């Protein structure tokens, strides 16, 4: 696309930060011009502060409006705590159990070595532990994770690979701990 | 920190593009469709348990546009620097021949929030069953987006995501196929 006209971008972010549910709440109101935060309201501070010279005129103009500062000060309750109770049942309390699969990688990059994949698909929330075991001893060498992948649809995936040297007499176990299940998920692979 | 809820809005000139959405720990709760003037919940079930008055979002966007015009002049007409996207293609789950799956095109770390995304099957554009998200915020004030293509895995078919952005010298292709 040959549209070379200059672009100008204005963003506003109202961030509600929660610690131990609604026990501690911090509101951060942020104004961003192009890619540079210019001015912000932090409920901990209680007024607008310029973060760049561009934002000075706005911090001065807004800080001199006593009722705006009052409404912003109360927002931690009328906005953050209010919205947390409305959303709590389908966000904070959301739980979705992973599908766990073990298979040899369709790609084998290392000789005398069987690369095994533990796939963990479709879980929520993000906190998860994936561990490899061989005849019930934990394996930590030769483990490589994609880490946490957000699918964009309120689910996560992760792939945890094990570089193995195949022997007779072995069972490999991928063990998954996740808040959605009361005991760990296990999937075995045998040669 | 247990959790973060963000109300993120933007206005972009000269495209005349406005967006209004809520984020919970990096996932979209909902956005307002500026054309239909209606709340669109990310998962339909969310709309069973909450509601939002969309006209509130349209009034905020009018103010945001008015403010962009002030800030544009106040900056001595300083335009945004283009940051081009990082692009990744992967499936929703491990591929099994003739078992339905979804290709994800993840477009990350870019600005401004304008991109043209196409799916290709065996070199030709495909639109059947495709879907996308709006522009999702990042803490560095860049954007993220996802595009999705449902498909039946085969050994015959190959796919690409095609991404166009002003920060790129050329349009990008990210390829996916299932071999052997």
């Amino acid at each position: 696309m040959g549209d070379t006209r200059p672009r100008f971008l204005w963003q506003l972010k109202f961030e509600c930060h929660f610690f131990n549910g609604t026990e501690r709440v911090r509101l951060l109101e942020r104004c961003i011009y192009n890619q540079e935060e210019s001015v912000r309201f932090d409920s901990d501070v209680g007024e607008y502060r310029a973060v760049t010279e561009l934002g000075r005129p706005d911090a001065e103009y807004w800080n001199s409006q006593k009722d705006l500062l009052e409404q912003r000060r109360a927002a931690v309750d009328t906005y953050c705590r209010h919205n947390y109770g409305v959303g709590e049942s389908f966000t904070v309390q959301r739980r979705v159990e992973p599908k766990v699969t073990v298979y040899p990688s369709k790609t084998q990059p290392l000789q005398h070595h069987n690369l095994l994949v533990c796939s963990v698909s479709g879980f929520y929330p993000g906190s998860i532990e994936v561990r490899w075991f061989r005849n019930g001893q934990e394996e930590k060498a030769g483990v490589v994770s994609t880490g946490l992948i957000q699918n964009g649809d309120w689910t996560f995936q992760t792939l945890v690979m094990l570089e193995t040297v195949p022997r007779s007499g072995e069972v490999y176990t991928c063990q998954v701990e996740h808040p959605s299940v009361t005991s760990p998920l296990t999937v075995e692979w045998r040669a | 920190e247990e959790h973060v809820i963000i109300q993120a809005e933007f206005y972009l000139n000269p495209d005349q593009s406005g967006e209004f959405m809520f984020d919970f720990d990096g996932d979209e709760i909902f956005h307002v469709d500026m054309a239909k003037k209606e709340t669109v919940w990310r998962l339909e079930e969310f709309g069973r348990f909450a509601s939002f008055e969309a006209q509130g979002a349209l009034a905020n966007i009018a103010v945001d546009k008015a403010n962009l015009e002030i800030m544009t002049k106040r900056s001595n007409y300083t335009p945004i620097t283009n940051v081009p996207p990082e692009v990744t293609v992967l499936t929703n789950s491990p591929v099994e021949l003739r078992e339905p799956n979804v290709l994800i095109c993840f477009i990350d770390k870019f600005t401004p929030p304008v991109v043209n995304v196409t799916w290709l099957r065996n070199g030709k554009p495909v639109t059947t069953g495709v879907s996308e998200t709006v522009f999702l915020p990042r803490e560095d004030h860049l954007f993220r987006k996802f595009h999705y293509l449902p498909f039946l895995p085969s050994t015959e078919d190959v796919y690409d995501c095609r991404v166009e952005h002003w920060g790129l010298d050329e349009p990008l292709l990210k390829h996916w196929e299932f071999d052997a």
Partner: peptide, 16 residues
């Protein structure tokens, strides 16, 4: 049913 309402912060005009 009794609607659970999300509340929006209102954006305000900058220094003119």
């Amino acid at each position: 049913q009794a609607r659970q309402m999300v509340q929006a912060m209102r954006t305000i005009g900058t220094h003119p």
